């Protein structure tokens, strides 16, 4: 919510209004990796979808 | 200096004379800056780049594009323009653009000889590119499977 507030800030100097869902699609892909922390099935440090 | 010259006899010191519109004969508001100026045309005569080509002859060995800058010209469809097509809600022209419209050398032949006869609908077929990758992995030991 800060990232969208910060990048949009850049767009404030640009006077742009974006439907935030998009800025976040980019953000969601950047967080596709979920480092499986707790020991379980896959591993103890296995990063997965 | 300019003005000194224009008062010698009796001349339009103000090259901003009032114009009579030849469309009928009315006068425009606020006389305008009109007169002689200098133009400079370049060598960009479009007849050096306007050598219309969209459908002609392609390559023999593979799907190689033969054309330069002047004669035999054509829009360069690249992987980035591919993403443009992958960027719009129009998925049907996308299908065409990377199958029958721009991929299969047999795809367009097998379809052009039917559009000249008239039939509004097409069918894919088999992309020869796949036929390369396909057999290649066969040498290693991989199986293609299409059931039901």
């Amino acid at each position: 919510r800060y990232i969208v507030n910060e990048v949009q800030d850049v767009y404030r100097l640009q006077g742009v209004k974006i439907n935030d869902k998009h800025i976040e699609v980019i953000v969601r892909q950047m967080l596709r990796k979920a480092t499986i922390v707790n020991a379980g099935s896959s591993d103890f440090l296995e990063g997965e979808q | 200096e300019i003005k000194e010259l224009l008062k010698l006899g009796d001349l339009p010191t103000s090259g901003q004379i009032r114009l009579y519109d030849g469309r009928t004969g009315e006068q425009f508001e606020r006389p305008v800056t009109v007169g002689y100026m200098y133009m400079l045309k370049l060598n960009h005569l479009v007849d050096d780049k306007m050598h219309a080509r969209s459908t002609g002859s392609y390559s023999l060995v593979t799907q190689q594009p033969l054309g330069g800058k002047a004669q035999f010209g054509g829009q360069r469809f690249g992987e980035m323009e591919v993403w443009a097509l992958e960027a719009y809600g129009a998925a049907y022209t996308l299908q065409e653009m990377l199958t029958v419209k721009s991929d299969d050398v047999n795809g367009r032949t097998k379809m052009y000889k039917n559009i000249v006869d008239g039939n509004h609908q097409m069918e894919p077929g088999m992309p020869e590119s796949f036929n390369v990758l396909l057999k290649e992995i066969r040498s290693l030991g991989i199986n293609i499977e299409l059931e039901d």
């Binding site: - | 030849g22 469309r23 009928t24 004969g25």
Partner: protein
């Protein structure tokens, strides 16, 4: 209502004149003003060079021993010939010239139908002592702007390969502009007048000019009347 009519045509010259219309009612100075202006500005029966066969021509882009410009530029001058015919559909104007002097529009074979209005119109020059030129300017009559480029696709089967095809610019007119002013008749409250300043190089008489144009409007209204 007093019928629309033109008073004595203000004639300052044979080439250019200005028609004057007195009995014009509310808005006709502009009605006919443009209804004639446009037609007068484009479609008019004129005479222009179509095909010419010069003797010393390997190719139209050649430098004939004795002329300042191209053979085609000789044809460039021929493009705007001020020739006036009386009835022929097409006519051949032979141009022969040998001797030190500017090949003017007087050394041409002066035919009875060929009436050049400006005799001193120099086409090209023949400055060499023992040199010569000889051609036949086949000029015909048409209307508008018709180029030999849009006509070059056919070749017309040419055995005498000296028949170069050149641009037929059929526009006798050049300056058509109308003005208006208060016209006063003896019986009426207010009338408009029209002064069409038309310019012709010397092929069509000013009256015959406004005659043809008005006539074509009549025929272009033929079909327009049926509902």
């Amino acid at each position: 209502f007093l019928k629309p009519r033109l008073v004595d045509i203000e004639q300052v010259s044979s080439t250019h004149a200005k028609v004057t219309l007195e009995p014009l009612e509310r808005g006709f100075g502009h009605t006919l003003g443009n209804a004639l202006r446009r037609i007068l500005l484009s479609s008019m029966p004129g005479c222009a060079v179509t095909e010419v066969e010069i003797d010393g021509v390997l190719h139209e882009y050649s430098t004939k021993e004795g002329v300042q410009e191209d053979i085609l530029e000789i044809l460039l001058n021929l493009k705007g010939l001020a020739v006036r015919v009386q009835g022929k559909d097409e006519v051949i104007l032979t141009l022969n010239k040998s001797g030190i002097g500017p090949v003017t529009a007087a050394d041409i074979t002066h035919d009875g139908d060929v009436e050049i209005v400006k005799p001193q119109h120099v086409i090209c020059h023949l400055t060499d002592e023992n040199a010569s030129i000889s051609m036949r300017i086949k000029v015909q009559r048409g209307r508008g702007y018709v180029p030999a480029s849009t006509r070059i696709h056919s070749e017309e089967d040419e055995r005498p390969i000296g028949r170069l095809l050149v641009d037929a610019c059929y526009s006798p007119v050049e300056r058509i502009a109308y003005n208006v002013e208060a016209a006063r008749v003896e019986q009426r409250t207010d009338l408009d007048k029209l002064v069409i300043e038309m310019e012709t190089n010397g092929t069509i008489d000013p009256e015959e000019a406004i005659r043809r144009a008005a006539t074509i409007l009549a025929e272009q209204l033929e079909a327009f009347v049926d509902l």
